Design an enzyme around this catalytic site. Structure first.
Site, PDB file in Angstrom:
ATOM      1  N   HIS A  41       0.805  -1.217   0.000  1.00  0.00           N
ATOM      2  CA  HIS A  41       0.000   0.000   0.000  1.00  0.00           C
ATOM      3  C   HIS A  41       0.841   1.272   0.000  1.00  0.00           C
ATOM      4  CE1 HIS A  41       0.506  -0.409   4.485  1.00  0.00           C
ATOM      5  NE2 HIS A  41       0.701   0.891   4.345  1.00  0.00           N
ATOM      6  N   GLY A 143       3.311   5.843  10.640  1.00  0.00           N
ATOM      7  CA  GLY A 143       4.580   5.612   9.977  1.00  0.00           C
ATOM      8  C   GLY A 143       5.311   4.332  10.352  1.00  0.00           C
ATOM      9  N   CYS A 145       4.328   1.198   9.606  1.00  0.00           N
ATOM     10  CA  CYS A 145       4.156   0.108   8.661  1.00  0.00           C
ATOM     11  C   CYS A 145       5.506  -0.288   8.046  1.00  0.00           C
ATOM     12  CB  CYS A 145       3.155   0.503   7.582  1.00  0.00           C
ATOM     13  SG  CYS A 145       1.460   0.598   8.185  1.00  0.00           S
TER      14      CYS A 145
HETATM   15  C1  LIG Z   1       1.024   2.262   8.484  1.00  0.00           C
HETATM   16  O1  LIG Z   1       2.067   3.042   8.952  1.00  0.00           O
HETATM   17  C2  LIG Z   1       0.560   2.737   7.108  1.00  0.00           C
HETATM   18  O2  LIG Z   1       1.612   2.816   6.215  1.00  0.00           O
HETATM   19  C3  LIG Z   1      -0.186   2.449   9.381  1.00  0.00           C
HETATM   20  C4  LIG Z   1       0.113   1.915  10.776  1.00  0.00           C
HETATM   21  C5  LIG Z   1      -1.072   2.345  11.825  1.00  0.00           C
HETATM   22  C6  LIG Z   1      -1.099   3.546  11.925  1.00  0.00           C
HETATM   23  C7  LIG Z   1      -1.362   3.912  13.571  1.00  0.00           C
HETATM   24  N1  LIG Z   1      -0.899   2.947  14.259  1.00  0.00           N
HETATM   25  C8  LIG Z   1      -0.646   1.784  13.281  1.00  0.00           C
HETATM   26  O3  LIG Z   1      -0.213   0.720  13.523  1.00  0.00           O
HETATM   27  N2  LIG Z   1      -1.222   1.685   8.747  1.00  0.00           N
HETATM   28  C9  LIG Z   1      -2.496   2.241   8.385  1.00  0.00           C
HETATM   29  O4  LIG Z   1      -2.772   3.362   8.616  1.00  0.00           O
HETATM   30  C10 LIG Z   1      -3.468   1.303   7.694  1.00  0.00           C
HETATM   31  C11 LIG Z   1      -3.389   1.540   6.189  1.00  0.00           C
HETATM   32  C12 LIG Z   1      -4.014   0.366   5.461  1.00  0.00           C
HETATM   33  C13 LIG Z   1      -3.133  -0.857   5.619  1.00  0.00           C
HETATM   34  C14 LIG Z   1      -4.135   0.684   3.982  1.00  0.00           C
HETATM   35  N3  LIG Z   1      -4.792   1.598   8.146  1.00  0.00           N
HETATM   36  C15 LIG Z   1      -5.180   1.255   9.481  1.00  0.00           C
HETATM   37  O5  LIG Z   1      -4.420   0.745  10.196  1.00  0.00           O
HETATM   38  C16 LIG Z   1      -6.582   1.587   9.934  1.00  0.00           C
HETATM   39  C17 LIG Z   1      -7.556   2.194   9.159  1.00  0.00           C
HETATM   40  C18 LIG Z   1      -8.664   2.330   9.927  1.00  0.00           C
HETATM   41  C19 LIG Z   1     -10.075   2.936   9.614  1.00  0.00           C
HETATM   42  O6  LIG Z   1     -10.340   3.452   8.353  1.00  0.00           O
HETATM   43  C20 LIG Z   1     -11.534   4.170   8.277  1.00  0.00           C
HETATM   44  C21 LIG Z   1     -11.126   2.951  10.672  1.00  0.00           C
HETATM   45  C22 LIG Z   1     -10.826   2.399  12.012  1.00  0.00           C
HETATM   46  C23 LIG Z   1      -9.467   1.827  12.304  1.00  0.00           C
HETATM   47  C24 LIG Z   1      -8.379   1.816  11.178  1.00  0.00           C
HETATM   48  N4  LIG Z   1      -7.095   1.365  11.166  1.00  0.00           N
END
Ligand SMILES: *[C@@](O)(CO)[C@H](C[C@@H]1CCNC1=O)NC(=O)[C@H](CC(C)C)NC(=O)c1cc2c(OC)cccc2[nH]1
Ligand SMILES: *[C@@](O)(CO)[C@H](C[C@@H]1CCNC1=O)NC(=O)[C@H](CC(C)C)NC(=O)c1cc2c(OC)cccc2[nH]1
Lengths: 305, 303
Positions: A41, A143, A145
């Site tokens: 992603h 950040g 991920c």
């Molecule tokens: C990564 O850093 C993205 O590169 C990020 C890690 C989270 C951010 C905060 N703490 C973490 O561990 N990942 C995300 O933001 C992912 C992105 C996906 C894989 C495309 N999204 C989520 O973790 C996420 C989205 C949502 C949401 O929507 C609407 C609603 C409720 C919870 C939620 N979690």
């Protein structure tokens, strides 16, 4: 003596962490030999993550659209491919700090060390256990991920986790290094709920063996049980059933204490049915379930890598 | 989100850990530039450790009596000196992995990362806190001496602990990198007791703030308390006094949650008097006191 949550030395993994950027989207990647692994992603814009089509989104990308940096030093991308939910970027430089490594897919209850990274810079390390509902109770910020979980045996690093998602309940979900998610989650910007969690029975038994090794053994009773009977009772208390592999990995601890696995299951069964009766085990009134039999042996025996 | 006992990445320290052997005594050493630091009791035999006159044993030692091994390579000792309980072995080779480092003495209630090592090989990393009675609740086995504790700021490693001994109660004691023990302990083979341990109050409050940031609020209440009235109850429960500096340090956590420090203090007072029943806070059945305010800020900022 002493019993703490112990992570592996992270040096071997620190030397493999890099930063991957597509447009303004940035996350962490894992640089092994001449290939960088990262969540797919990274090719998504903020609005793209709501309902992405990674096949269509990746078609528009070329090698020159990927910014891979070890610190401030760019690694030229010379090839890209997608495997499930991970992106594989071939770079023109083989990582001189690449350790002996392997990609493994762990089971629920297995523990691993997480090297939390931000913008390719390691920031912390801690122990995590894969919950039976395929989540981990981690500590992740924006950040994070790309951060990986790993185990080290001898001089070989076994990578088992790459971070992707934080659920609404505050727990986290990810994939193995082949891009296959742990659990029924998908890499999309949606609120996803995990199933009801359970207690890792094999780890509770390991924690009881640890107590016996330290002279704390009041909970040992004169009962025994079959594996099938214990499994049926354990599920009544939201405890995970035991597998043949669980009985086997408890072997060393069973031989060290002279207490058969099924005898200790009968002891644990009594603790679940009658409770703890005002007593404690290893100073705690709670049964700990995030120490594996290996974690108990490794810590009680000082194994090195 | 989430809150976990987190240690610093240990890579910069792993590149400094060596093995030091004198006779049949073996432990870990810290190799910085062309100097190796290790506990001085490595020069002692099993019988010497009962009552060691370290100045006497050291003068009778030669450079070749010390076997320093860095992986599969042996370092030649070209000089040896003593600074308190720390032996300093000058070698002919400078460690190319030497990071930017400093030697500091940590204050009670402060945390640091421990790299447990055996035979010069890193084995595990975890975070400890310097208890008010100058012990630490770590995980150390035979051969763990030489292991160091540290913090990392930017690219600088601040070494603050080197392990020496385990008390009969199971807690551990050691020195700073200048060889001065934390607490009233001595590097002799005797059973030694520490002072009465107290609870790090400012840390418990920071950990309660981390619980609120992560959705745990059942322990909160509408009552408030004065700083002095809180300290009266806290000292009654063998808690360390809370100073105005502690209140100031908790400021950022108070602003993020909107809960005044003295409001959190009223919550802790109720927890100390009534207990937690069977309920838990951040998965713990006890009040955790080994998280500093900065430990909480680093993990829960922006949540
Ligand atoms: C990564 O850093 C993205 O590169 C990020 C890690 C989270 C951010 C905060 N703490 C973490 O561990 N990942 C995300 O933001 C992912 C992105 C996906 C894989 C495309 N999204 C989520 O973790 C996420 C989205 C949502 C949401 O929507 C609407 C609603 C409720 C919870 C939620 N979690
Ligand atoms: C080092 O590895 C020795 O090089 C060792 C580390 C402890 C071993 C077990 N767990 C540890 O952390 N340190 C010691 O063995 C020290 C030796 C020096 C001289 C300080 N000794 C102790 O830690 C010790 C001695 C005694 C004792 O005597 C008699 C009686 C009761 C407790 C005790 N601890």
């Amino acid at each position: 003596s002493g019993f703490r949550k112990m992570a592996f030395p992270s040096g071997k993994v620190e030397g493999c962490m890099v930063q991957v950027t597509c447009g303004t989207t940035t996350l962490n990647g894992l640089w092994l030999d001449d290939v960088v692994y990262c969540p797919r992603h990274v090719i998504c814009t903020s609005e793209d993550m709501l309902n992405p089509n990674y096949e269509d989104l990746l078609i528009r990308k070329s090698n020159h659209n990927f910014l891979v940096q070890a610190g401030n030093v760019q690694l030229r991308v010379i090839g890209h491919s997608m495997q499930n939910c991970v992106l594989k970027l071939k770079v023109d430089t083989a990582n001189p700090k690449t350790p002996k490594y392997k990609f493994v897919r762990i089971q629920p209850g297995q523990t691993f060390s997480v090297l939390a990274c931000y913008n390719g810079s390691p920031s912390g390390v801690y122990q995590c256990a894969m919950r039976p509902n395929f989540t981990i109770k981690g500590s992740f910020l924006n950040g994070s991920c790309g951060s990986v979980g790993f185990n080290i045996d001898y001089d070989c690093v076994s990578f088992c986790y790459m971070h992707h998602m934080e659920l609404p309940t505050g727990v986290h979900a990810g994939t193995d290094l082949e891009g296959n998610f742990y659990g029924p989650f998908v890499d999309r910007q949606t609120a996803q709920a995990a199933g009801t969690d359970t207690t890792i029975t094999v780890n509770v038994l390991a924690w009881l063996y640890a107590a016996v090794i330290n002279g704390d053994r009041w909970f040992l009773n004169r009962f025994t049980t079959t594996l099938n009977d214990f499994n049926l009772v354990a599920m009544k208390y939201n405890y995970e059933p035991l597998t043949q592999d669980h009985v086997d990995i408890l072997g060393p601890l069973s031989a060290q204490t002279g207490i058969a696995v099924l005898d200790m299951c009968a002891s644990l069964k009594e603790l679940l049915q009658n409770g703890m009766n005002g007593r404690t085990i290893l100073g705690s009134a709670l049964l700990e379930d995030e120490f594996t039999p290996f974690d108990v042996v490794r810590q009680c025996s000082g194994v090195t890598f």
